[PDB]
Amino acid sequence: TPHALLLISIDGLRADMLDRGITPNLSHLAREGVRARWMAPSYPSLTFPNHYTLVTGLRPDHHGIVHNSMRDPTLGGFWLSKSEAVGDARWWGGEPVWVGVENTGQHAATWSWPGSEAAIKGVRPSQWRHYQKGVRLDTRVDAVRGWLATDGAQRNRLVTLYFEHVDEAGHDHGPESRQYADAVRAVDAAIGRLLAGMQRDGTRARTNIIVVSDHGMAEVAPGHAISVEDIAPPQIATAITDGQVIGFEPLPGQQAAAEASVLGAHDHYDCWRKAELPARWQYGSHPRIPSLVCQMHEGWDALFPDKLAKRAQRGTRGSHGYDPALPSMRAVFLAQGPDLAQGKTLPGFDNVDVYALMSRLLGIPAAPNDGNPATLLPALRM
């Protein structure tokens, strides 16, 4: 029986958060194993695009989950709260690690990983669910603990675990806030209880472990919020998305007015025709991407007008979704276990490279992907 992988995502954990004395368990794990200086998200530095890149080794441009909210000619609208869109395999391109695992006779078990509610390439994990808000830390930790300990025919090669708590506190109060730090401490403590119980179960010693985050978090000070219609009025172009990566689709015959008012440099954003976007972002080829794409600057939000009023103007808040080469957008990568090096540090690298490492650790043939299989070989013990 080969060594299991445990894949843990802490949403919006910024890469410097391991070096503030608030992650004792993750810091111990890094000392015991392998730690990257940081891991750079793919564009857009949003939650669904980047979780799915992590498991596919593909840029959002290739895998089709190009934003959290999308429209498609055949499939219509997609967003995080339209359940039969998220559960529709047709949105999800490529092959995520759980599909590759089950296709080998082995079994994957997911706690709420993006894409895990759909039969991607007609393949569901053996364990999965419909994401619901407000689940307890110990509830999900103890469930994952269960699935690592199972045996016989219901033995899992892969187990995933997700935590929203850090991401949600960053939006609410910013990454330098005490709430964000408490969220980090809480998720770290929860992972320590998982790890301790895995030892008591005797699964820790045969399980490889990888902890990552999908991106980091920038502070969004008060007064750093504008209307999407300050960028382009409704009469000329439809704001497909808001937040930090704003997509416009010009009303029929308004391409020229939309472009004259939108394209180029503005106070706190810039905009591009999708095929002319900065090539380092490797983004803009997928048809599901709107015709015009605007990138807000670090620290700034553009919101649908109805939000912009009801946003109780007071608190420091936060956001991601900015340029993935920003230090503030940097995610975490660490790993530890029987097939991984010990006491090792790795240069900063890009999140597409994670796929090739997991595929080896999971004993699956690696699906075609955008990453470099050489990058994370040093992470392996031998």
Ligand SMILES: Nc1ncnc2c1ncn2[C@@H]1O[C@H](COP(=O)(O)O)[C@@H](O)[C@H]1O
């Ligand atoms: N599988 C899921 N289905 C629906 N919503 C999710 C899921 N996973 C996380 N979320 C929530 O959606 C948000 C992601 O948006 P963002 O972090 O702004 O890119 C997080 O703050 C989570 O609370």
Ligand SMILES: [Zn+2]
């Ligand atoms: Zn996220």
Ligand SMILES: [Zn+2]
């Ligand atoms: Zn977020």
